[model samples]
Every structure is written in C-alpha cells, then in structure tokens.
Target: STGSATTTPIDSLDDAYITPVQIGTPAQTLNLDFDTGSSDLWVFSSETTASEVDGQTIYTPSKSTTAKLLSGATWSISYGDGSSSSGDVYTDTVSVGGLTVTGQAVESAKKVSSSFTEDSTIDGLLGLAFSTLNTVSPTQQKTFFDNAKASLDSPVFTADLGYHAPGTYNFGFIDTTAYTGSITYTAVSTKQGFWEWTSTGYAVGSGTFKSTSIDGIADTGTTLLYLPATVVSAYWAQVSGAKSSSSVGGYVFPCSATLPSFTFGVGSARIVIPGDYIDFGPISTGSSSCFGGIQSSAGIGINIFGDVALKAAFVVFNGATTPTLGFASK
Candidate 1:
C-alpha cells in the first residue's frame, strides 16, 4: 500500500509542522506534529487535565468502539528542551494519509508541558523514529510506520518540508517527481534511535567547500538548524553584521544583512540552503535585530539538521531490511 499526506507549517515562523491524523473508529481527526527524532505516537485526549487544556482538540476513547485499554501499559517522554508528556496507552485503529493500521498503540496524554500546551496548533506528536525509542513500559510499542511497513509496497517514507507553503509526506514509495537530479544515499546509524547520518562537508555562500565530517540527526520536529560551533561560526562570519548576543539567546544580525547561502554534502550531492532561510525573523514583535536560524549545537551536545535545513531538500528515511537515508535537491 502507498499513501501521501500534507504537512502545513504552524505559522509564518515555521516553528513546527502539523499533519492531520485519523484515530479511532469513526475518525477523530487531530493535527499532530510528525516527529522524526522521537518515537511513540502520543496525543492530547480526554485524559488530559482540564486546567492544561487549551483550544486543542482532544481524543476520547469512549467515543470509539475500536479503542481498547492496554492494561498495565503507560508511557512518559521528556524532550531535551524540557517539554514532557506522560499517560496511559491504548490500542486503536489509526490511519494517516491513506494507510491504515489496526491495533496501533495510541498514547493518551494525562499531563503535558507548557510548551506543548502553548503551541495551540499541535495537538500531539506522530513519532517516526525507530520503535526502540518508544517510551512504553513493560512492553514497547511499534510506530505507525513500523506497523504499516509490511503492507506497504516499500518500507520507506519520504519527507518534503516547505518554507511558507505545505509539504508532502509519502509512504510505501518515492515520488520521483518530488525531487531533482539523483538521490544520494548514505548509511544510517540507528543505535541512538534517530534518523542519524553523516554529511561530508559544507560551504558558506560562494565560498569553497570545507572538508568536515558532520554527524547529525534529521529532526523534523525541531525548528532550527544546529551544527558545530566551528561550522556556525564560519557561516555567521560571512555576514558582516552578525554577532552572538547572550541577551538575545543566540546569534543575531541586522534585518537587512546580506546573508550567505549554505551548502552541505550527502555522499557527493550538495543541498544548498538559501541565505534567506537562515534569517529566522525579528528578535521581537517589531525589532530590527533578526536571529540566526543556524546556531551552534555545542551547547546541546549533539548536532542536528532541523526543519530549517530539511526544508531545503527532499529526504528519504528507508526502513527496509537495512536502514539508510537518501537526499536530493528539490
């Protein structure tokens, strides 16, 4: 089986992306963030506390005949950013795009962090990372992609994130026309339970490519691009007005700065990110100082290619017999 879905940016800042998901018997549709960096499909539900509930939609198990409690099962997940969610587990019919999986584990949140609650646009997360990272206790659960892999024509999913418009997520098969030229392949190390891969090197706008090995994860759930301090420093140095500001929480520059384009290599193919992509937005509601979308990962202890970089190319997370990642220009 093959299917496709659309992922829309939550806002102009592209803080996060949301895709509609169908849960339960009659289809309780909820906008969920598709997180490739984390595992365990969780959702906002009737189980959540009233005080924590904002304007987000909630999933009610009582409304679905197919929903069954997973006795003795519970899940709790905390992100690096300090956001957390924990709740009991339920098995129900869950569908995405055009693919359906019965008895898919659905984690109903009983508690959520303010970050999740304040998002307002995202109801929960649809984890696409390896099932080994699932937070369920006793018996771990498989992600929707893992459960649907068998029936799918191919055991792979592709992500095509956009800047200001909607993007596409294709399962089971690749949309050949979605990319250009050839797709470069790279080995993926799932020991960390992430879509982790290595890039050969990078280059600042118009500058020659530098030979550097960057090991990072492609995290669609995250908003910005984070590389080593050396790499980001080199990038920002190319822009005359750029400087790090602790008060601003990151490197910022004049809103009118002429930013340089960034290019990174996967295998031998280079994916170029336009300089404008790095000009995040104003530091405040109406400020002339703009934050740099690309920051240093040294503070976080790990490098990551987030939506800012991912949106610049097409990505394939192949979960076939052996895991691999494919990148292509779009």
Candidate 2:
C-alpha cells in the first residue's frame, strides 16, 4: 500500500541495529539485519577466527561473485546492551522482500562477539532508521535507502512488530490500508544530532491523563517505555490498590485488576499503547502487579515508546524529505 512520509522524533540506538538484509541469489537465501544507525552493513564471515560463525549463517564473500570487501576499512560497534562485533566494510547486493539494491556499502562482521553468537534467529540487522547517523563518512556515506529510494514503488518504510513469537517486524513500503483514515503530522525540530522530542502526557485505560505532564523523547531504538516517577505515581493513584513495588524494573501493580487503557496525545491523534506492553513479563515474585509503562533507565532518557509503542502507531523518519513528523494509524 502507499503512504505519505511522516517524521516523528525518536531516540536512536547508539549502535545501528535493524531488520536483516537477505543475501545471495534465488538459490541460497541468507537473512541479515539492515541498520541505519551506522552506514556499513556487515554479516558474519567464514574467515572470522576468534568469534566464529559455527552454526550461525555467515555471509560468504565467495558466494557472491560481485561482492567487494573494503580491505583497509574494518571496524567494530558496541551497543548499550554490551554486545559488540568487528568486521570489514564491503559492497554487496542486498535484497529485502522483493526489493533489491546492488553495489550497496555494508559491514561484514567477521568476529561477532558472544552476545551476537548466542542469538540464532536472523544473522544481522537492517539499519533503515536514518542516514545522518550512518557509519559512512560524508565522503563515502551511501545508505541502502539512498540507493534503493529511486527503485521503490514508494520511498517509505513502516515497521510492524508481531504481537506473538519472534515478533514479526517488517520494513519497506507501509500498507496504508491498515490505518483508520487520513494521516496527521507534526514538524520535526532538529535539536540534537538524531531526531527527538518530549511527550506532553499519556492515557491509561479509558482514563485519559490530561493533568499529568511528562517529559521524554520518542525512541525506536529503545525497546520499552520508561515513565517518570511522578507520572508513575499519578497513574497508580488512579488504580485502586496499585502500590509501587520495586520488583523488576518499573512500578509493580497487580495484573488481576482491570488495567486502565493509556493514550498519549501527539497533535490531533492519540497514540495508544496496549496494556500488555506495560505489564510484559509475569510478576510472580510479589503478589503485586508488574509496572510496564514507567520504568527506570538508570537516569537515562525519560520516556521511550520502544517497540511496544511503535507497534500501535505508524512512525515516519522524514529526515530525507521534510523536517516534519507525520502521524498515521499502523
């Protein structure tokens, strides 16, 4: 389906991690994650000695007759999650779904650390978040989007996370049909390097949080929503017997209670986050309920509408087009 470009301020993961880019031709298919946080798209190679790609799928340079590896420019990326990998810069043909882009500059991580070796799902990430934060220098930065924009039916990408196992997250042309009606938008102000903004308030259950004022940035890189202490207290106050227990990460409330629905107003639309995201894992230790929305980040950024929030709404990274945040239904 076709959709317009919407720009929403989101916090980026320091390390560029995203959907994987499938390599090889029709015969052998290898899935990889594409990342825009950094420009290079590298996969685990067979030559990796220290951290080997034992059972994991490694991107073979020999497989692609046209693949070109940047012999001199090799680098490693470390994330807040303590995962790191080292690889060489390379140019290869990348395919996502039906879309294909050749001569794409990417990173081939030969020595993937233990953190990455553990996960046996997809090989790597497709960094489609933005280009400004790419690893490619101004002299050499050429993102997948930059190369594929002209070929795409629509030069827009939307991410839809699966509510179930492995949480299916797909990017590329967003299906506008899933949305309710028309899209509403807001302008993106470039204050920091990456796009970011502060949310005014949020809603829970049918109870709309009009009085509660919250200051936090909208982030796609972050996986969870982190609320302020004051906001958490205010939200708990609304629910009966919802006491704050330092159990897991955020505030803990009983899961038995009929949790109120929460919504955040961004311009005309109200971005609603499901209650399941707030109360993710079971709170077995304590009889109290688990708090999902308001969690501590060790004094990091305030609120992050991680993958949980992104699932419910359509987010647009409009850095390529206009300096505006356009919002529509997912």
CA lDDT of every candidate: 0.93, 0.55
**Backbone atom clashes (below 3 Å) for every candidate:** 0, 36
lDDT of 1 by residue, 62-171 (tens): 99999999999999999977899999999999988988999999999999999888888899999999999999998999999999999999999999999888999989
Candidate RMSDs in order: 0.8, 5.7
- The number of the candidate with the highest lDDT is 1
Per-candidate TM-scores read: 0.98, 0.76
Candidate 1 lDDT for residue 31: 95
| Model 2 per-residue lDDT tens digits across residues 1-330 | 222222222212212123445565432354554332334455666666644565666777767776776656666667545677766676777766556777776667767778677655446655554455555432354666667776666555554443332223333454666566666665554454344554556766777457444544445555555666665565667667676565454566666765555677666567776666555544654545554554554466435555556656766554445544445665
